Amino acid sequence: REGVFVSNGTHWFVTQRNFYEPQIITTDNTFVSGNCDVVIGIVNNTVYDPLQPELD
Amino acid sequence: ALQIPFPMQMAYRFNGIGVTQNVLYENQKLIANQFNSAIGKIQDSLSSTP
């Protein structure tokens, strides 16, 4: 939604563009669009959803 | 100067005019073709215009 996917060699994060402040990639800060074979250069990683661990 | 891949830069600009960036990643090929054609016609237009 805002920022860029940044990797530090082994882990992926989302960070605002103008100042480094890494956050975990979550369902809250990303949005979905179509299947993942049309975009070029797409990569794989876990996008945690905060509702599952709570299991309310 | 901080380097950034050119398609991500254009996604930034698309976002700037109020169109979400997924619109660019799904039409990267088409957009590149339109841009190439426009740049090609500029020189011909400048030369034929009196």
Chain B stretch 1-50, residues whose beta carbon is closer than 8 A to a beta carbon of chain A:
7-8, 12, 22, 25-26, 28
- φ/ψ of A47, rounded to 5, equals -110, 95
Task: Please state, in angstroms and rounded to a whole number, the distance separating the CA atoms of residues B36 and B30.
Answer: 10
Q: Which residues of A touch B12 (CB under 8 A)?
A: 17
Resolution reading in Å: 3.4
User: How was this one solved?
Assistant: cryo-EM
**Residue B15 burial (C-beta neighbours within 10 Å; 0-12, 13-18, 19+):** middle
Tokens of A49: 């959803």
